[PDB]
Design the sequence.
């Protein structure tokens, strides 16, 4: 070049770029690459107005600066203007982002760093970890100087012994008084624990209702709303028997059980269909050990290779599969306790701010079916809707927790051969299972996956993929998928091999994971499927909700017919 | 077949796909002769009607050599009890003659003394079948094979909450997720010796598929070689 001593020493980028000015071709030769030189020149351009002094240029080289829009920002900053930690950009929690990973990768988003997908005027932003704010703009300092481009309680036993006086719910609906005439009548209707109080419109729980703290709200007399509050997290596997006392040695497969069921509702308040759950009219009323898929636990010679290869008709008599007046599809998966009531999820009904195209005339039900086409009178029954009630722990700004709801049908309560509820007794035999290690199964049909993720190059299967996710310790759920787990939030899974489609997530919401017990003959349910991170995405743990916290409000639902 | 890779065309000829009423393999099959198929006797509790589609290489579609064969009668062990975990073996005499061709060649019995002195004394063993590609992953669309090593008796005993009888032996990995799984119901697991694969056994039960600390509970073929022959000549 200009100096002959330059060519005497072999090419080292320092001597051309720091000592003097390096052009495109000289920096290309010294760097032995074109894309690297282009990226270096872009980071160089980041300090076009900030090249002086040199530490400012070094700050541009490391980055951490986004003035103006910030879509080209590729730095390392977590702090927002408010100061809240940003949600993991790779993850999609705690809400549904309309900027999905398959539409706008233009942000170059990274889990630990802020980016700007929409090129916001204020700068790169992020969704807040906490549900207080929908999204917080990432306040990023300017290169070279310490200035920013844009200016900077748990409830005991789910309300059994709670004394909070909060009134506003998460969505915004005000609560009705617990002392109202309808609420006073419901006080006699629902057996309350003697050592609990209920006053005004506070989220109470006098009956041991493990739904968390919920308040009677306006509209339907008895409609329930949840005050916006945080809740703790617990673990179960760490305890051995305790007062359980069932056996001395260990045995996991090969157990038979026969017994009765203890109810939690007044028989006058629930009528027929109360003390018969957890069984099947065909398979379990005769109390006979049934075919291949349930044989996995009961067969002594078989614990890992059974593989019936099919899920014949009626294997899930207590699962619901919705239609809308839209082209035939399931909005939110659901399970059946009885023909009259369907336990749908609350996410689909009330996501948009306008709150429309989710109405009663749209939704239709069919239950206990291998495929969504075939139907007969004695298999299940269909009826119109009158009013749908939503969960006041959900909105477009909230964290989507406790996504469960119901639907008020017309024709009265009835059962069938392919219709039977599932029982939910206490933790005694659950501990027996935990210290005995028994296996279970989950059901569904596989359309909620289609609603939350899209399939390309392969049609959506109309048949449930009958593959099981066993019970795994809670931390495995916590680190496999990164959606926060509430107190009403269940977890399960297996030691996975990534890269393939979710094994039991092929299914719908509300898919009961039912699991055999040695003292009841009624296979136990532990989780109701909800919005899943690894479910709605590829090959990770599907989410459930704690059924132990979803088992007390059903009593008063049938009486509105008789009111 | 947790993990693993596809059987190359002809690599697993005795391996058969026991097609049930819906013609999807409810069990792993093993060609034995021109008229015989091998499966674990647990497969007898999972059947409405069933056939043997020998030569199948892909459950997605027919891709050559698929001949449908119908089981004449099952030779179930009379001492076969699920609780014993033992005699989980069902010889399937066929109505349709097995046509020895590409991907059709059985595995026959070696010397009982030599088999005991050599087969169960090997290092690793090869398992094949349209099995679950992972511990719970989807069933292998292609005919996928896998190799698993032998496990010491005491290791299997401590690794099992149940009995590890004089025959049953563990084979797999302590924590690595690779073994037979759902799809290898009676799925033929073999062992190479001078390119002649020898069926050293088939998983019966176990906690999960290649779980942590767990192994496939295989059946000692050398234990019942005399019974295997006597059931070859039975029915
Ligand atoms: C940002 O947060 C991540 C956690 O994902 C942490 O590892 C990283 O050090 C943080 N970086 C900055 C610049 O705050
Ligand atoms: C339902 O949503 C569609 C969008 O496809 C809209 O055009 C229609 O008006 C909606 N129905 C209403 C608002 O009643």
Sequence:
């Amino acid at each position: 070049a200009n100096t002959f001593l330059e060519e005497v020493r072999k090419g080292n980028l320092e001597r051309e770029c720091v000592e003097e000015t390096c052009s495109y071709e000289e920096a290309f030769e010294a760097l032995e690459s074109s894309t690297a030189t282009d990226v270096f020149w872009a980071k160089y351009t980041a300090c076009e107005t900030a090249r002086t002094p040199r530490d400012k240029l070094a700050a541009c080289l490391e980055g951490n600066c986004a003035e103006g829009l910030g879509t080209n920002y590729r730095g390392h900053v977590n702090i927002t203007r408010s100061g809240i930690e940003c949600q993991l950009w790779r993850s999609r929690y705690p809400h549904k982002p309309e900027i999905n990973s398959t539409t706008h990768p233009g942000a170059d988003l990274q889990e630990n760093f802020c980016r700007n997908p929409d090129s916001s005027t204020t700068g790169p932003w992020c969704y807040t970890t906490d549900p207080t704010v929908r999204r917080q703009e990432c306040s990023i300092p300017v290169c070279g100087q310490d200035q920013v481009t844009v200016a900077m309680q748990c409830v005991p036993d789910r309300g059994q012994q709670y004394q909070g006086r909060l009134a506003v719910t998460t969505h915004g609906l005000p609560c009705l008084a617990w002392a109202s005439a309808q609420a006073k009548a419901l006080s006699k209707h629902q057996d309350f624990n003697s050592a609990v109080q209920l006053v005004e419109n506070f989220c109470r729980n006098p009956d041991g209702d493990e739904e968390g703290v919920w308040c009677y709200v306006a509209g339907k007399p008895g409609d329930f709303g949840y005050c916006d509050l945080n809740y703790c997290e617990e673990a179960v596997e760490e305890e051995t028997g305790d007062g359980l006392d069932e056996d001395s040695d260990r045995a996991i497969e090969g157990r038979t059980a026969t017994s009765e069921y203890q109810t939690f509702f007044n028989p006058r308040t629930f009528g027929s269909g109360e003390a018969d759950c957890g069984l099947r009219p065909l398979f379990e009323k005769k109390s006979l050990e049934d075919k291949t898929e349930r044989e996995l636990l009961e067969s002594y010679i078989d614990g890992r290779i059974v593989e019936g290869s099919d899920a014949e008709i009626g294997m899930s008599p207590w699962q619901v599969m919705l239609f809308r007046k839209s082209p035939q599809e399931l909005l939110c998966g659901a399970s059946l306790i009885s023909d009259r009531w369907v336990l749908t999820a609350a996410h689909c009904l009330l996501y948009p701010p306008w709150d429309k195209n989710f109405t009663e005339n749209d939704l239709l039900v069919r239950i206990g079916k291998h495929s969504r086409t075939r139907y007969e009178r004695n298999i299940e029954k269909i009826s119109m809707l009158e009013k749908i009630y939503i969960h006041p722990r959900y909105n477009w700004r909230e964290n989507l927790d406790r996504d469960i709801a119901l639907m008020k049908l017309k024709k009265p309560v009835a059962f069938s051969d392919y219709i039977h509820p599932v029982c939910l007794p206490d933790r005694e035999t659950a501990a027996s299972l935990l210290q005995a290690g028994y296996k279970g199964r989950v059901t569904g049909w596989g359309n909620l996956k289609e609603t939350w993720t899209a399939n390309v190059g392969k049609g959506q299967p109309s048949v449930l993929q009958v593959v099981n996710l066993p019970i795994v310790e809670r931390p495995v759920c916590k680190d496999s998928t990164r959606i926060r787990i509430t107190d009403n939030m269940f977890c399960a899974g297996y030691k996975p091999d990534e890269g393939k489609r979710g094994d039991a997530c092929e299914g719908d919401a509300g898919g009961p994971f039912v699991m055999k017990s040695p003292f009841n003959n009624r296979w136990y349910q532990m989780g109701i499927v909800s919005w899943g991170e690894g479910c709605d995405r590829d090959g990770k743990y599907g989410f459930y909700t704690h059924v132990f916290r979803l088992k007390k409000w059903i009593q008063k639902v049938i009486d509105q017919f008789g009111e | 077949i947790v993990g693993g890779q596809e059987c190359k065309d002809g690599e697993c000829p005795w391996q058969a796909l026991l097609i049930n009423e819906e013609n999807e393999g409810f069990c792993g099959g093993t060609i034995l002769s021109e008229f015989y198929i091998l499966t674990a006797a647990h497969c007898l509790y999972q059947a409405k009607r069933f056939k043997v589609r020998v030569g199948d290489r892909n459950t997605e579609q027919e891709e050559g050599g698929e001949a449908v064969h119908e089981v004449e009668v099952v030779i179930k062990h009379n001492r076969f009890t699920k609780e014993t975990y033992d005699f989980d073996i069902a010889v399937l005499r066929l109505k349709t003659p097995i046509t020895f061709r590409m991907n059709v060649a059985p595995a026959c019995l070696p010397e009982r003394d030599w088999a005991e002195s050599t087969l169960m004394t090997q290092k690793t063993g090869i398992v094949s079948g349209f099995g679950r590609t992972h511990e719970k992953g989807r069933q292998s669309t292609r005919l996928k094979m896998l190799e698993v090593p032998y496990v010491d008796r005491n290791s299997c005993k401590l690794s099992s909450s149940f009995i590890i009888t004089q025959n049953m032996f563990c084979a797999g990995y302590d924590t690595k997720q690779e073994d037979a799984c759902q799809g290898d119901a009676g799925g033929p697991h073999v062992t190479r010796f001078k390119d002649t694969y020898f069926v050293t056994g088939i998983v019966s039960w176990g906690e999960g598929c290649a779980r942590k600390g767990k192994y496939g509970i295989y059946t000692k073929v050398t234990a019942f070689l005399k019974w295997i022959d006597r059931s070859m000549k039975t029915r």
Summary: The first strand of chain A starts at residue 125 and ends at 127. The radius of gyration of chain A is 29 Å. The interface with chain B takes residues 250-254, 291-292, 295, 299-310, 437, 465, 467-470, 494-497, 500-501, 503-504 of chain A (CB under 8 Å). The pocket of 2-acetamido-2-deoxy-beta-D-glucopyranose (ligand 2) is lined by residues A 356-357 (CB under 6 Å).
